[PDB]
Amino acid sequence: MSKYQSVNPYTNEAFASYDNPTSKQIDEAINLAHALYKKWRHEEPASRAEILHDIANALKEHEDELAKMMTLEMGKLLSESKEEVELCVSICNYYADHGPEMLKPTKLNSDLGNAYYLKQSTGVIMACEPWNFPLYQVIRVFAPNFIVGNPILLKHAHNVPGSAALTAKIIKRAGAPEGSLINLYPSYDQLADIIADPRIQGVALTGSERGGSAVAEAAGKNLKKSTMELGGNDAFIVLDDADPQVLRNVLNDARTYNDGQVCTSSKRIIVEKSRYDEVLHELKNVFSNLKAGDPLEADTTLPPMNSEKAKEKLEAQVKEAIDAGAKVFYQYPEIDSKGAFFRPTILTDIAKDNPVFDKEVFGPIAEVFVVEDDNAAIQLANDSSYGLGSSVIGSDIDRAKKVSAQIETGMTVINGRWITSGELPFGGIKKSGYGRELSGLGLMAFVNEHLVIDVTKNN
Template sequence: MSSAIKTINPATGDVIDTYDLMTDEEVKTAIRACHDAFESWRLVSLDDRADRIRAIGQALRDSKEDFAQLMTREVGKLIGDSRQEIELCAAICDFTAAQGPKDLADEERDIPDGKGVITYAPLGVIYGMQPWNFPCYQVIRYAVANLMAGNGVLLKHASNCTGSGLFLQDLMARAGLPDDLFTVLVIDHDQSDRVIADDLVRGVTITGSDSAGRVVAQQAAKHLKKTVLELGSNDAYVVLDDADIDLAVETCVAGRLYNNGQTCVAAKRFVVTEANYDTFVDRFTKKMAAMEMVNPSEAESGLGPMARTDLRDDLAEQVRDSVAKGARVLCGGEVPDRKGAYYPATVLVDVAPGQPAYDDELFGPVASVIRAKDDEDAMRIANDSRYGLGGGIFSKDTARARELAARHFDTGMVCINKYNLAIPNMPFGGVKNSGYGREHGGFGMKEFVNAKSLYIA
């Protein structure tokens, strides 16, 4: 295995930078240093921790342009999306700083012959493995919650955005976070398994595919380490009989192509009732076909490249396999003859079980449109997936859509007549093969704490 990591601009194919992997001894030293920093940090008051979190948010805003440009170079995000990502991360810091001292404060309860106290004690060093599609957000989401809880944080970032991970490490130091409390490990997968096994690591979290989640969960289980898994999905957006079709089309195009189609909770499967199917497919396909491929460093809109050529090629193979098994391509569907990891906005119809377009996650700008007989059939198809991270319902009867979402949609997040990413004050996470555990909304701050009971006479 190579002893170095090269990051490559997916829009041009040019090498951005090269990073040496850490030695095993350097990794052990880094884990020990993070644990030592935690031993002091856990004694810092909640209000003082909140001040540091607030400062991280300000540092993100102060560094927005430099960080956004780096993310766009590393993973091909549209520059406007990169800037928005930094703003979201700063908002997460603001929410965490404001809410953390309240959510993590001691709670008192009446008990026989005394007083009961619940105190939220940090666990220790928490190890996170994060993907490339949101190089800042994926890290901030788990790191800030755990720092607020009093834990130390280790990060193994995706290799193709190593620079973004190291940028965050420097940024947190500039914001006044104690040395070594947030540490980036530039390591390979074998070394990562040894990090999970280290006695000083008390919890493990990963955002990634369901196959990667299984491997990490098994490794952590061997050592009785708690895990939080945010894994893949194949989110269904359901267009019911009474949907506003204009709204549904506009929203579904945006939901499928945001972040160049590489979002865990992107709209991916579009389940449309017969009453609306032909109209939806016609309008939706026209808008997808009109989407131009652009240079992400210059464009605020359009479709940028995928993050790596191998990921683009995997997506192209999923499309070919789906077509071989009966799907039809209405637009796109071919790797363009141009430099970079580009793939066009693609619409597939006649999508059915047994095809990757129905069964699996297509992590790129490919939409799977599925015909349903009626509203009941549409909800059945929406739930006919091994995943359950997000989804959506389009209906003019908002009360009925809310009832369907709350009682019948087997997923972690449902958008009604809109498309939404995760936001700071709402819980985020999945069910089934999309993982377990929750982040955001105050929930993430309590995933890796010891809810300790005190019984006082």
């Protein structure tokens, strides 16, 4: 029945299962959230800023508990889980400190009358999030919308129900009124019904193309505004003038952070010929020195994939890639464990007709391509159905900026791998989705820009 279950990927053992709610429980949740939305309409955003700061403090206070729950449910290295909490504390403080200020009415220049638009709330938002960054994905949507005054109903990934519940509890106890963030374990059908309720006025999703399509289709059918933060197959472009040290530092985790289970992981490493062998050698150095083990242990640098099912899907993708012509430049040694460990692998010679060429590969799989010049790098970078993030490594900044501009993608980091922060917009184009989260753009995602114009003079 319910697919919501906590299964430790390191021991491959389940430790908790959760049921789908009843129709009554769902209605009660929507009722509470909608009631809160109405109440918030009469309370300034600044009035919630203090509470958001307290939430930031509560997250810090529960950092080790939150990190452990994450690591237990989806295998992330504890160190990375803690970094995620720190990032979330920062995001909460960011919106607590800058949100209300960015919601002040905006004056419009018009000779038609005295005009301006207010930035108002819209209603309850149905947030659907993935298992890869269980806290950050939630906070990315919660923080700004809490300030705006949009209550959130959360449907988290089926495999992080414990982290989802814990997050919601901490936030409520920190001071967020009941209804601010309600965690629910709905079936796909229940989710569809919730989206069809008139009290729901926004749909935000981060996840897979498959899940995205279904949810976005439902939002559309019901004419609800939506934001889609999907996967990516980011081009990591290494120019011939890349600084050897910068390149080395970045390759340390450009593809292996969170075991490569990152939408902005540097999946397609595009190297200009003179640096091809150099990049391959460095990747092999990085990969070969990883250490598999309990993600809760400090010496572990290679965690298991989030689930045995995820490991198996990856094995299938890689096999299909190899059977189509991809070559194995390197593969980590066999790992003796009942855990969902996948061996870091470096693939080369992936042709345009290879099934994996335009497919997002979630896992520790470096995909290296060799190109002749800048134009070829850009052409290959854009020969993609995706467009989330990207990177350009080169010492000549002017050159790097010029190349960056030509990449059809939502974000580009010069001399660094993926990055995220409260002040920076996050989002993509094409199959990677639409809309932006974080920064002022994400803050306005579900805001009603209410135009008010006094035209008394002309009537």
